[PDB]
Amino acid sequence: VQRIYLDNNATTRIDPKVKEIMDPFLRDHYGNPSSLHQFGTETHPAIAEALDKLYKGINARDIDDVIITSCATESNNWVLKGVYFDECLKKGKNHIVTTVAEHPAVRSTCNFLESLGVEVTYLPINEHGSITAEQVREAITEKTALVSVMWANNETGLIFPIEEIGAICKEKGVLFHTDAVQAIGKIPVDVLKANADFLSFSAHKFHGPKGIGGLYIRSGVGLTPLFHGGEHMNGRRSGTLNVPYIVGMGEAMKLAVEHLDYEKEVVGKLRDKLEEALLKIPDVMVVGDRIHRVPNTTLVSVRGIEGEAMLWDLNRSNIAASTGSATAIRLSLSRFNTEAEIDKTIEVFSQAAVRLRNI
Amino acid sequence: VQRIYLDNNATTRIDPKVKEIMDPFLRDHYGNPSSLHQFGTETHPAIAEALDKLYKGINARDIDDVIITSCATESNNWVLKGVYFDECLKKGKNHIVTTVAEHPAVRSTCNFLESLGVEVTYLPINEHGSITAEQVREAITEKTALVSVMWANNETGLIFPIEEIGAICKEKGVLFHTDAVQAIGKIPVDVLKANADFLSFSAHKFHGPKGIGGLYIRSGVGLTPLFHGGEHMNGRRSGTLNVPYIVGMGEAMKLAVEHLDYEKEVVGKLRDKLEEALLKIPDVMVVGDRIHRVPNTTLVSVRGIEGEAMLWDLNRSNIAASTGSATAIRLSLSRFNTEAEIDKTIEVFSQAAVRLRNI
Ligand SMILES: Cc1ncc(COP(=O)(O)O)c(CN[C@@H](C)C(=O)O)c1O
Ligand SMILES: Cc1ncc(COP(=O)(O)O)c(CN[C@@H](C)C(=O)O)c1O
Ligand SMILES: [Cl-]
Ligand SMILES: [Cl-]
């Protein structure tokens, strides 16, 4: 069989080059980076080069941190629970501003915070699919400790106006976190433009392994550790480093960035091909704005069918994809897809479409 | 060159079989276990078999949890910070009992807890190297929320009387966590014998990859998540699973347990060989008790030399090891060592010994 993968916002294949680069750290460079002897020191250089790659991915300066984590969910829980202790409790700054769009790691953590007594406002989503900036402007109180808005949306592919949000946040004196998980490798990411104080990502959205990610922390911004024990990552996050996955994720980030133009021109073109082909069906509205999306995503709906039903049929034709908020169907490409696979999807989708209608 | 690795309590080589089993999950079974389509469902079976292996390693029942984490430091921070919220805050049970022996993840987290207002008593270590049980008996107040004692000590290899501690904890109504990181693969581990409510481990102490670990949670014991977001691990710890490392760590645990007798009879014998050979030097006292140690560790001191100096010289002779509390030298074997390598160490150590004395 010839299977087609269109669920890249759920996770992604590890790049062959990523696999190849981690391999010697599963084989004989197994030493613990903290060890003082050769087994440890010999991992130094590769670690350093990984970190360089991460820095250059997100336009982070020497004086900033990019801390390695076990995934974006760790990152996001760290940021929220750290600012709770540093701001909400110790500074009485008892309010967080976020959106209804956010990943559940963010939203569940916020919920928990409310349980303890933080007030969290959850910004509503507009007709244009997006949040405005002015919406955050108008929410930022005296008490506001942090604003958290995701860079791009995992369900619709919509880019939020981070940066404008950056500015509104600078002007008003407030901590700014952006969850940038679905922006890496998909559009350029620049914490400087963004005035991020905090930024999250996870390798497996850009062809590294599941099980690692980063939190960008800006210079001189405190954030009480989520993993105390304090020896690794300048005491910001304790635990023996995941050497192999570090090295992998370096590589991934690099390749991700190198492919920005390819993502834009080629993958985006593929997405468009697909999109147009599918709008030719009947009442197949696309979902949300079409102009401010990451290149690789399209969330279509289909008049009289469930998303789940569509998905299940697609699966039997060896095509993988997932749902989103109405349900609707999310098709999420990557550089690994080809025009052949799109064409095929167009066929198998339309057949499936026609074939499920009468029920 | 022929290098000799004796720093197994710092980390360990991934077993070839562990490497081999994770490999297809870095290659083409890259789907996200949550996905509903084949790419996801096809990871189901291997995940399940991994989990089975983990269960059987630690004598955990079906109705218990073994939750996958990013490492033992995650585990330990989870346990302490969860019981703070479930017990210290919500039940007014404002005291934790632990030892001075514990890993810094435990101790730093405790320190942080104190910062917020928990009272933590830190049980002092005795002349016999160990903690008694009666010592915990006598500390358990009305207010005591949790007792945390490590199963074996990473610095000395000393086994604490967990189980007796289990009983004293059952009788008095108190939550029992044991950090068992250095017991996996080294002596049998049995949460049932132990009345653990919580038990930690990390794969890289038993020849799986760094960057994953477990928290055993006993049936019906709550523990407010450290990673909110709640979709993975029955909502106890959110984040896309580390499929490859799961599968690896399964395998590791299995092999670890299969090798218990080999660890006892062969590795322990090797350790003894080494130990005796080195006691023949001059005022080379061994450090702590010699009778209740995991098979693989020995912490020697050397009359007139620093530990660091000894280590550095050893490193130049291609032998890897680390220090411990007075400083002293820790030599930590695994099944991968051979009598040849010991012999060699005996030589290179004694030469180094004699050669560093006059200064
Ligand atoms: C924007 C965003 N933030 C955070 C996460 C969580 O990353 P980890 O699971 O690596 O912590 C994801 C992945 N989500 C999946 C569940 C999806 O979109 O289908 C995401 O898309
Ligand atoms: C008893 C114990 N608990 C917890 C940990 C932390 O595990 P992770 O780093 O996998 O979270 C270790 C490893 N320690 C090293 C630093 C040593 O003994 O030399 C340990 O020995
Ligand atoms: Cl915290
Ligand atoms: Cl928590």
Curated annotation (Swiss-Prot), chains A, B:
Master enzyme that delivers sulfur to a number of partners involved in Fe-S cluster assembly, tRNA modification or cofactor biosynthesis. Catalyzes the removal of elemental sulfur atoms from cysteine to produce alanine. Functions as a sulfur delivery protein for Fe-S cluster synthesis onto IscU, an Fe-S scaffold assembly protein, as well as other S acceptor proteins. Pyridoxal 5'-phosphate binds at A72, T73, N154, Q182, S202, A203, H204, T240. GO terms for cellular component: cytoplasm. Belongs to the class-V pyridoxal-phosphate-dependent aminotransferase family. NifS/IscS subfamily. The keyword Transferase applies. NCBIfam families: nifS_epsilon (TIGR03403). InterPro entries: Aminotrans_V_dom, Cys_deSase_IscS, Cys_deSase_NifS_proteobacteria, Cysteine_dSase, PyrdxlP-dep_Trfase, PyrdxlP-dep_Trfase_major, PyrdxlP-dep_Trfase_small. This is Cysteine desulfurase IscS. It comes from the Bacteria.
